[PDB]
Design a protein around this nucleic acid. Structure first.
Lengths: 94, 78, 98, 104, 76, 80, 98, 93, 104
DNA sequence: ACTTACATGCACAGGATGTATATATCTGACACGTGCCTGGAGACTAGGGAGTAATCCCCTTGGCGGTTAAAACGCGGGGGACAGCGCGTACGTGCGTTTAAGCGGTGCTAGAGCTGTCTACGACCAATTGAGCGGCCTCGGCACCGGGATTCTCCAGGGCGGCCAG
DNA sequence: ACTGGCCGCCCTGGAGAATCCCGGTGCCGAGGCCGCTCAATTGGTCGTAGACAGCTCTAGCACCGCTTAAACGCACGTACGCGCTGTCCCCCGCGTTTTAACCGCCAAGGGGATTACTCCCTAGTCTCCAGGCACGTGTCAGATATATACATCCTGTGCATGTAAG
């Protein structure tokens, strides 16, 4: 048998928070799925090198944020850092 | 059979590119540029196929090839 | 008879295909082209249906964008007709001559 | 018990991301905040595209997002267009653009 | 609707007023006529048209170029 | 505030000369100052981003090298 | 007096700088340009001398290459004088339009 | 304070191809950056190759395939020859 | 006996092997991987050092400078392609004046 | 003096066509049900990478002073950019003809995918030392600076040939 | 008519000014030595994932028949692209003049590369559910077709300045 995990269900959840009455085609979900995995690989790859470059063996929030600052253009980066910081803070409070 | 990619097929693409007038010499040049493009991508694709020890080129092989050349494609996985 | 003017139908086609998103090259002829080019790498290659589509999708997307640049080059030379010399300039700035 | 996703107030899987980092050959150790921060950034960009894609779908009297809308959303957005300047969206088509000098 | 003699008379007047080897071009004549006479907005078209017809008659003779884009002189 | 004018016309001309340029419009010089400015803004931004990561107040050569590489403009002869 | 002809001294300059490798921008002025631009990211920034030099090399290499491409756009349009329009066309195909 | 580099190895190679020719430090730096660059380029791809096929070992195969992908035409053909050669000679001593 | 000598290489097989292990590329590294890689690195290094040496000699010099590297690479079709996106410091450019600009 | 003809602009008729509009209907893609398997917790341990204050001291910033290469301003006249005109003609639109793409059903299997083996290859800790890095002298290829000598650009000063100007 | 003058053209030496090339000479970085670390190498333990043989079956080529839709061939007429020409002024080249970059210099201190001490974060493991997958069924957003209201393109007619014919 075969089991292929995905980001499908999470992308759909996010869609409902942003546009509750809108749906999405299979091909579009695939594209969305490729995009998230892409961004994941990109950011993590850069963070990986950042850790290597600065002779650290741990990827922390610090590297990810800096990786984000490097890869995302202008305003995108700013809000991405805002969202990143927000989430990590709330998670630490528990 | 490379003559198969014809004028009316080429001319639609140009239209989509926003082109209004096309020199007759454009059509053969386009066939040539396209072959080159395909040669490079197919080359890397097959290279991935052989590393996996497969005789069938999968879609991922093509995707990985396109990514290697900075032309990532969405809607086939990857 | 009704005959319009040169460029009128042309412009109509531009507006048309820029609005739609279907592949503009004939599937089967292109699929044969892929295998032929593939011959020069490995004998008796098999292809996933999606692999051929991914190639065609990527191929048309490449050419379409190239025509956009070719167009700007033609216009830059105070023309409305794309010519071989227009493609050469665009590709040269881009890289990978010939 | 509380899911780590919920603790960070995220829709994206902090759990999955955290694992993918460990088995991804990136570093010997992964900080507790790292997966949360990354997941947060991934959800934002997804939401960003969706809000614009949603609009694009709406602008054609359609409720279902198709590749064409994703295309229109990205290429009409300055910040997304640059972030995805080297990506090609299948069945996405091209943005309507006719140069002034060709118009009658 | 201001007063002005014919274009044939004006061009001939403009060429002969200008002592010059290559007679005169289309540009030379046009600026002479504009400052030495009350002429309308379509001076250029009428100048263009008049040289076309004077050449064919052999009233105007050609020096450099071919057609309304050139330099020309009067015949003897 | 007006130090962007320090990249003088003569200086801009020599570069064009090395580029094989023979004749230069007067409007080229200000536009050239602008492109270079944009170029520097993009590179320095990433360079400083590397600096802050290392928790340093001083931008090192490697920071610039990494910055350039990040932008698809790899540079040889300074490290890495 | 001796005055040559327009373009003659230019070609001599072209050949001259294509033969050498020294930096063509004034060292000190460029350095000031860097710190001013850096201000808008972090205040009281310090620089390594070698850092500023690495920037000038890249910067001049970028511009030199841009002028080569720019020059080709000019010539394409049947001119021998580069113009703003030429730089805009080169950069457009090159990316980093804005 | 010790920083390692390919400095000493590049010179030995230079002396094999042109024994009476030297190299300036700046030129040597450029050469050092180049070797280090190529190292990073090849390894990243081999890493990805090992990943795509769900394997956790970087073998001579990933290196070879990486070379075929990264290096243009005839360069790859001669690179693959040398890599093959090297591995053979090493495995026989 | 050094590992370099066993493969008949100048480049450090041992160093490359270490760099691979501590470089976050894979859980394990094959025995032949460092050998294959060092040979390829050595070849490319030799290829450029070969062309550069010839270049310096052509300008009547015995010591290699950045300029000789730039000339060597950009004149070699294959190396040029390989290094199409690299900029060599103090390397300058190759003399190329467009035909129409010349006088007659 | 009136009428006719270009050649321009411009209004607006025009049907003729291609666009987008609404309403009725059908088709099947997607969002949501169910059991079922695997990762994500949850709780806790121990090893050590990373945080800490504090140590040299390397290297950036800072000031000065004289020399002068280099940027600035002005100033003519030439070589270019640009607009216009006439000409040839490739490119477009369109219809009638021709070819093979596209769509359907189906047989037959090469090959991708999966499971289950267990041999062999690579991380792992430990021990020995010699490979390779950080100073330290010289000295020679090269940078610096002098005088001829070769190459190149050019603008006069002719001599040949065109055609008003008279 | 004819002459005479001005104005073109092609080339044809030398004056003016750079460039290559030869020469002697000051010198700072390259090449080599050699001190001392710590990384590489030999030697064997394990533990697993990669090599490998076996399997099922999803999926690829492959043939056949079928309509039509897409290509294609052909021929008109236009407007677009190249060439030539003429004018204006923007760009060049040059000399003076004024800026300040550059160099060589000494002087103060931020903060960069490195230290040990040790806290506190992280990997590693066994153990229960449930979140997320594959797996289904039914509503419905989208696609289609025919009617038709709206928008677009294109000729053909009238009309101030002109120029001839009577």
């Amino acid at each position: 048998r075969k089991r292929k995990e995905s980001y499908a269900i999470y992308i759909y959840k996010v869609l409902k928070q942003v546009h509750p009455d809108t749906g999405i085609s299979s091909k579009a979900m695939s594209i969305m799925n490729s995009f998230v995995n892409d961004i994941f690989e990109r950011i993590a790859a850069e963070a990986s090198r950042l850790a290597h470059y600065n002779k650290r063996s741990t990827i922390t929030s610090r590297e990810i944020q800096t990786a984000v600052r490097l890869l995302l253009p202008g305003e995108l980066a700013k809000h991405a850092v805002s969202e990143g910081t927000k989430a990590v803070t709330k998670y630490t409070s528990s | 059979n490379i003559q198969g990619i014809t004028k009316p097929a080429i001319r639609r693409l140009a239209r989509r590119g926003g082109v209004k007038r096309i020199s007759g010499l454009i059509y053969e040049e386009t066939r040539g540029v396209l072959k080159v493009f395909l040669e490079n991508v197919i080359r890397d694709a097959v290279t991935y196929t052989e590393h996996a020890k497969r005789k069938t080129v999968t879609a991922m092989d093509v995707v990985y090839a396109l990514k290697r050349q900075g032309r990532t494609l969405y809607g086939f996985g990857g | 008879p009704h005959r319009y003017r040169p460029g009128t139908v042309a412009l109509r086609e531009i507006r048309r295909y820029q609005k739609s998103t279907e592949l503009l090259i004939r599937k089967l002829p292109f699929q044969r082209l892929v295998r032929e080019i593939a011959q020069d790498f490995k004998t008796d290659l098999r292809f996933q249906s999606s692999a051929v589509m991914a190639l065609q999708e990527a191929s048309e997307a490449y050419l379409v964008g190239l025509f956009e640049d070719t167009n700007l080059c033609a216009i830059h030379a105070k023309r409305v007709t794309i010519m071989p010399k227009d493609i050469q300039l665009a590709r040269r700035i881009r890289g990978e001559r010939a | 018990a509380k899911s780590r996703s919920n603790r960070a107030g995220l829709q994206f899987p902090v759990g999955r991301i955290h694992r993918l980092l460990r088995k991804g050959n990136y570093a010997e150790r992964v900080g507790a905040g790292a997966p949360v921060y990354l997941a947060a950034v991934m959800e934002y960009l997804a939401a960003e595209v969706l809000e614009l894609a949603g609009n694009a779908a709406r602008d054609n009297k359609k409720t279902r997002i198709i590749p064409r809308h994703l295309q229109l959303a990205i290429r009409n957005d300055e910040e997304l267009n640059k972030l995805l300047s080297g990506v090609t969206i299948a069945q996405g088509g091209v943005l309507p653009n006719i140069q002034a000098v060709l118009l009658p | 609707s201001a007063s002005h003699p014919t274009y044939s008379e004006m061009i001939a007047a403009a060429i002969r007023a200008e002592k010059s080897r290559g007679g005169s071009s289309r540009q030379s004549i046009q600026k002479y006529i504009k400052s030495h006479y009350k002429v309308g907005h379509n001076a250029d078209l009428q100048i263009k048209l008049s040289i076309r017809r004077l050449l064919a008659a052999g009233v105007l003779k050609q020096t450099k170029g071919v057609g309304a884009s050139g330099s020309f002189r009067l015949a003897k």
